[PDB]
């Protein structure tokens, strides 16, 4: 909860799960680094024309 | 790597390029303009004609929708493709 | 013959070689080879060659300009329109043809593409892969009706659209 520590409360409640913990800098641990991106508005309109021949 | 062609799709194996009869070129100003005149179509053979869709087999007649006859290339290879 | 041998095609029955004279439309091919060693001068000559080539068939027949990039297609179409307006040759493509002119004017107003609407009033047009499908189809539909005098597009149109 180091990045979005504003969501961390001393008196909050949490359940547990028998799983393996993620890394400190995992994708789900820093949502502000992956979710604050502006959406692709009027994008790929002047991109490059390349056909994905294999896909 | 030595035997491969570095140009890829632009590699030219021919050293000389022969153009048509009326294919003169001239450099006007900073660029060379080479004009290739429209080649006249080859005369039709005495026993060659554009066969219509009514001569091909009835099975292939449904695919040729909207075309009364066939092209010159298509008519010359109609028996070799069906 | 090497391709036929690679494909296991008999040279007598399966071999068929038609020369360039067998094309349905005999096309007079013109090659413009820039000889200048300066990149800036070569680019300027290419724009002048395109403008000179467009002016050779301004009101005679439609022109299908082929570009390399989507942004260049718009720049080239506007580059030709700007040169035509500077030289007072903008009216050659769009004569007193209000039937064709009104359709282009009417279609340009309803078009949602800002770049296409700038040339929609004139004979210029753009057809790129980044454009909307409805907008791209109108250019193909407008070009097939002899409405767009000059069509500028990338190599995708030549393969994805059978519009000569």
Curated annotation (Swiss-Prot), chain A:
Changing residue 34 to L: In RP13; reduces interaction with EFTUD2, but not with SNRNP200. Widely expressed. Transmembrane segments: none annotated. Residues 21-55 are annotated as: Required for interaction with EFTUD2 and SNRNP200. It comes from the Eukaryota. It is found in: Nucleus; Nucleus speckle. The MPN (JAB/Mov34) domain mediates interaction with TSSC4 and SNRNP200. Has structural similarity with deubiquitinating enzymes, but lacks the residues that would bind the catalytic metal ion. It is linked to Retinitis pigmentosa 13: A retinal dystrophy belonging to the group of pigmentary retinopathies. Retinitis pigmentosa is characterized by retinal pigment deposits visible on fundus examination and primary loss of rod photoreceptor cells followed by secondary loss of cone photoreceptors. Patients typically have night vision blindness and loss of midperipheral visual field. As their condition progresses, they lose their far peripheral visual field and eventually central vision as well. Plays a role in pre-mRNA splicing as core component of precatalytic, catalytic and postcatalytic spliceosomal complexes, both of the predominant U2-type spliceosome and the minor U12-type spliceosome. Functions as a scaffold that mediates the ordered assembly of spliceosomal proteins and snRNAs. Required for the assembly of the U4/U6-U5 tri-snRNP complex, a building block of the spliceosome. Functions as a scaffold that positions spliceosomal U2, U5 and U6 snRNAs at splice sites on pre-mRNA substrates, so that splicing can occur. Interacts with both the 5' and the 3' splice site. Part of the U5 snRNP complex. Component of the U4/U6-U5 tri-snRNP complex composed of the U4, U6 and U5 snRNAs and at least PRPF3, PRPF4, PRPF6, PRPF8, PRPF31, SNRNP200, TXNL4A, SNRNP40, DDX23, CD2BP2, PPIH, SNU13, EFTUD2, SART1 and USP39. Component of the U5.U4atac/U6atac snRNP complexes in U12-dependent spliceosomes. Within the minor spliceosome, which acts on U12-type introns, interacts with PPIL2 and RBM48. Core component of U2-type precatalytic, catalytic and postcatalytic spliceosomal complexes. Found in a mRNA splicing-dependent exon junction complex (EJC) with SRRM1. This is Pre-mRNA-processing-splicing factor 8. It comes from Homo sapiens. The chain holds residues 2281 to 2335 of 2335 of the full protein.
Curated annotation (Swiss-Prot), chain C:
It comes from the Eukaryota. It is found in: Nucleus. The modification Phosphotyrosine is found at residue 51. Widely expressed. Catalyzes the ATP-dependent unwinding of U4/U6 RNA duplices, an essential step in the assembly of a catalytically active spliceosome. Plays a role in pre-mRNA splicing as a core component of precatalytic, catalytic and postcatalytic spliceosomal complexes. As a component of the minor spliceosome, involved in the splicing of U12-type introns in pre-mRNAs. Involved in spliceosome assembly, activation and disassembly. Mediates changes in the dynamic network of RNA-RNA interactions in the spliceosome. It is linked to Retinitis pigmentosa 33: A retinal dystrophy belonging to the group of pigmentary retinopathies. Retinitis pigmentosa is characterized by retinal pigment deposits visible on fundus examination and primary loss of rod photoreceptor cells followed by secondary loss of cone photoreceptors. Patients typically have night vision blindness and loss of midperipheral visual field. As their condition progresses, they lose their far peripheral visual field and eventually central vision as well. Component of a core complex containing at least PRPF8, SNRNP200, EFTUD2 and SNRNP40. Component of the U5 snRNP and U4/U6-U5 tri-snRNP complexes, building blocks of the spliceosome. Component of the U4/U6-U5 tri-snRNP complex composed of the U4, U6 and U5 snRNAs and at least PRPF3, PRPF4, PRPF6, PRPF8, PRPF31, SNRNP200, TXNL4A, SNRNP40, DDX23, CD2BP2, PPIH, SNU13, EFTUD2, SART1 and USP39. Component of precatalytic, catalytic and postcatalytic spliceosomal complexes. Component of the minor spliceosome, which splices U12-type introns. Contains two helicase domains. The N-terminal helicase domain has catalytic activity by itself, contrary to the C-terminal helicase domain that may have a regulatory role and enhance the activity of the first helicase domain. This is U5 small nuclear ribonucleoprotein 200 kDa helicase. The chain holds residues 659 to 822 of 2136 of the full protein.
